Amino acid sequence: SVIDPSELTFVQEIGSGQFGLVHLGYWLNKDKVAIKTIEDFIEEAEVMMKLSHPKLVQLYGVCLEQAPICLVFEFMEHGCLSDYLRTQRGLFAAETLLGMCLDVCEGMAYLEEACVIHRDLAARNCLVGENQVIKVSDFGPVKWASPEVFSFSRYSSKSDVWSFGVLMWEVFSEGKIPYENRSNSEVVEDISTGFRLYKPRLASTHVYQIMNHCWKERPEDRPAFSRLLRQLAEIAESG
Ligand SMILES: N#Cc1cccc(Cn2cc(NC(=O)c3n[nH]c4cc(-c5cn[nH]c5)ccc34)cn2)c1
Numbered sequence: 438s439v440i441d442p443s444e445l446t447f448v449q450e451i452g453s454g455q456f457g458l459v460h461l462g463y464w465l466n467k468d469k470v471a472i473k474t475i476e477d478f479i480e481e482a483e484v485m486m487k488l489s490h491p492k493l494v495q496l497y498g499v500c501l502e503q504a505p506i507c508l509v510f511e512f513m514e515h516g517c518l519s520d521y522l523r524t525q526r527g528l529f530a531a532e533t534l535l536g537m538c539l540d541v542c543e544g545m546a547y548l549e550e551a552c553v554i555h556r557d558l559a560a561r562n563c564l565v566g567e568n569q570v571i572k573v574s575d576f577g578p579v580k581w582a583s584p585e586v587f588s589f590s591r592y593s594s595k596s597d598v599w600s601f602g603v604l605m606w607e608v609f610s611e612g613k614i615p616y617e618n619r620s621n622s623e624v625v626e627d628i629s630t631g632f633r634l635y636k637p638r639l640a641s642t643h644v645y646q647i648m649n650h651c652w653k654e655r656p657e658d659r660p661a662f663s664r665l666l667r668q669l670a671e672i673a674e675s676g
Pocket of ligand 1: 494511517
């Protein structure tokens with residue numbers, strides 16, 4: 438990485454050590470960003486900016502001088518996880534897919550500890566960056582929804598855990614559509630009767646056990662992301 442002089446602007450001398458004189462300066466950086474267009478939202482911005490974790494897409498600031506009002510986010514090199522898995526189907530090792538779930542689980546455990554509830558945890562709301570890293574976006578439909586959410590709209594970290602179970606299935610199936618040829622009412626019928634998404638070939642028996650644990654009827658039966666994180670981190674290290 439070489440910086441062209443145009444980008445640099447000297448300001449004042451800030452003393453000198455033994456080898457060379459040091460100066461204060463401003464470096465004009467032209468960085469890639471993802472810009473999302475549209476009292477009400479100005480409150481949300483500073484709070485979202487306080488939420489900092491390497492496994493969550495970062496909010497850099499909000500631009501609101503005039504309409505369309507827009508949010509400046511961290512750029513994620515390879516787009517949404519759903520499309521990433523779909524176009525790369527067959528090019529995935531079970532370790533890369535597990536590693537993707539662990540990435541999501543890290544950001545989710547932080548959001549759980551911060552008492553922030555995601556309402557749409559799905560592979561489409563997860564993004565791929567440098568060296569296949571996965572980060573969570575759109576934090577603050579029935580296929581990823583837990584019984585309490587499609588029946589009574591009762592959101593919590595445990596409903597986010599259900600969504601994570603569906604996300605894990607999307608990851609290990611390499612971006613396949615959950616309950617593909619079923620409608621919003623058919624999905625509700627099947628889940629209530631106790632049926633769950635099949636074990637994908639790439640997922641081990643232990644990974645599928647974790648998925649079904651995220652898919653328990655009672656939300657208090659489902660494990661916390663803090664519990665899910667320690668478990669997945671062990672499988673990722675031991676193999
Ligand atoms: N240079 C270049 C270039 C040009 C075209 C396509 C791509 C590949 N690609 C990368 C993305 N990245 C993003 O979409 C993205 N990167 N950061 C994001 C944040 C949000 C977001 C939405 N709500 N909250 C966050 C949504 C989307 C993003 C999409 N396609 C890269």
